[PDB]
Amino acid sequence: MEDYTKIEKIGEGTYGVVYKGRHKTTGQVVAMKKIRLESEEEGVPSTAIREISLLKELRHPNIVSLQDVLMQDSRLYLIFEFLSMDLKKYLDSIPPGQYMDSSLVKSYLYQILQGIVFCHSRRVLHRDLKPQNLLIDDKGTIKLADFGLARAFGVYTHEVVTLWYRSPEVLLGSARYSTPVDIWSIGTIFAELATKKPLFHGDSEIDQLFRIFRALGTPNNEVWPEVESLQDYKNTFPKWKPGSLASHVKNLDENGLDLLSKMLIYDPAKRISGKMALNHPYFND
Amino acid sequence: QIYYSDKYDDEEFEYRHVMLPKDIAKLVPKTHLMSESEWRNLGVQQSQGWVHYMIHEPEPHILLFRRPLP
Numbered sequence: 001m002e003d004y005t006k007i008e009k010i011g012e013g014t015y016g017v018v019y020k021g022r023h024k025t026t027g028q029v030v031a032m033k034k035i036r037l038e039s040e041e042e043g044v045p046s047t048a049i050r051e052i053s054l055l056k057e058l059r060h061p062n063i064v065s066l067q068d069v070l071m072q073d074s075r076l077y078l079i080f081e082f083l084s085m086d087l088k089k090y091l092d093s094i095p096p097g098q099y100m101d102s103s104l105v106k107s108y109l110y111q112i113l114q115g116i117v118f119c120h121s122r123r124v125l126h127r128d129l130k131p132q133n134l135l136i137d138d139k140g141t142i143k144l145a146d147f148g149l150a151r152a153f154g155v156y157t158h159e160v161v162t163l164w165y166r167s168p169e170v171l172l173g174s175a176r177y178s179t180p181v182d183i184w185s186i187g188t189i190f191a192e193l194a195t196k197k198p199l200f201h202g203d204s205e206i207d208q209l210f211r212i213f214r215a216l217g218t219p220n221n222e223v224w225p226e227v228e229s230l231q232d233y234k235n236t237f238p239k240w241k242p243g244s245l246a247s248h249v250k251n252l253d254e255n256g257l258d259l260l261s262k263m264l265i266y267d268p269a270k271r272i273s274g275k276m277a278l279n280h281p282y283f284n285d
Numbered sequence: 286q287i288y289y290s291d292k293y294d295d296e297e298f299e300y301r302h303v304m305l306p307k308d309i310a311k312l313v314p315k316t317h318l319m320s321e322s323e324w325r326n327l328g329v330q331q332s333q334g335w336v337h338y339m340i341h342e343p344e345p346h347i348l349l350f351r352r353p354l355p
Binding site: 173203204205206207210214231232234236237238239240 | 288290293294295296297298300302304338339341342343344347349351
C-alpha cells in the first residue's frame with residue numbers, strides 16, 4: 001500500500017474484499033483484492049503463494065492481468081487492472097424483448113475461448129467460471145478474471161450462482177477433473193449470451209443435475225463411459241431421452257447449436273477442447 | 286420453513302423434491318429411505334403414494350419423491 005491509495009470499497013468477490021485504488025507513481029487505476037492468509041506451520045512452505053507467483057507471469061489480452069502481489073502483516077494484496085463492467089451486469093442491462101447482437105455473441109465467445117485456450121495451454125484452469133468473472137472494457141474487449149485462484153486455495157448460496165455453470169463430472173462426484181470443466185462452463189455461458197437466461201437454472205446440486213438431464217438425456221454408460229461408477233450416480237434418476245437442445249435456446253444458427261452441443265458432451269474425454277472450438281464454422285465473421 | 290419444488294416427469298413416474306431446513310437433516314436417516322409416516326413426521330405435506338426413492342448424499346436435506354403414473 002505504499003505505492004497505492006485506496007479510493008473505495010467495491011464488493012466481496014469470493015476470495016477477498018475488493019477495493020478500487022490508484023498507483024501513486026503511474027496514476028494507474030486498479031482493482032485490489034485484500035486477502036488474509038491462514039497462518040502457516042514452521043517448515044511447511046505455502047503452495048498458495050507459489051501458485052500466485054506463477055500466475056503473475058501470465059499476460060494475454062483476453063485475461064485480466066494480475067499486475068502485482070504484495071505482502072503486509074500476513075495479508076496479501078492482489079493488484080489487477082480496474083474494469084467497471086462485467087458480463088452479468090451487461091446482460092442484466094439489456095432491455096426486455098431485445099437480445100445481444102448475434103455477431104457480438106460470436107465476438108465475445110471467441111475472445112473467451114482465446115483466454116481459456118491460453119490458460120489451458122499454460123497448465124492452468126478456471127474451475128469456477130461464470131459471467132461475473134468475464135470483465136469488459138470500453139474498448140469492447142472481454143477478459144477472464146480469477147483464473148487459477150481456485151487451485152491456489154480450495155457460505156453456501158455463495159456456492160448455489162456458481163451451480164449453474166458447473167460440469168456434471170463435478171456434480172456426480174467424479175474422482176478427477178481437468179480442462180473439460182472450463183469448456184462446459186463456457187458452453188453454459190454461450191447459451192446465456194444468446195438467450196439472456198441461464199441455461200441450467202438449478203436450485204440445488206441435485207436439481208442442477210436434473211435440469212441438465214431433462215435437456216441432454218439422463219446419462220448411462222453408452223453415452224458416458226464409466227458414468228454409473230461415479231460416487232453420486234444412481235440408477236434411480238429420472239430417465240429422460242435426449243434432448244432437444246435448439247428447443248432450449250434461440251438466436252443461434254446451426255453452427256452455434258452444434259458448437260454448443262459439442263461443449264456440453266457428457267464424457268469429458270470426448271468433449272470439445274478450447275482449440276478445436278476456435279476452428280468451428282460458427283467463427284467465420 | 287420447507288421448500289417444495291415444482292413437479293417434473295418421465296414417461297414412467299412423476300417426481301418432485303422437497304428442501305428441508307438444515308437443522309433437521311441431522312435426523313434424516315442416512316442408511317435407509319423413509320416410509321410415508323416417517324417423512325410426514327418431519328412435517329412434509331403432500332398427497333398419498335409419493336415415495337422417498339433416493340438420496341443425494343451431499344445434499345441430505347433434500348428429499349426426493351416419485352410416484353408412478355397411469
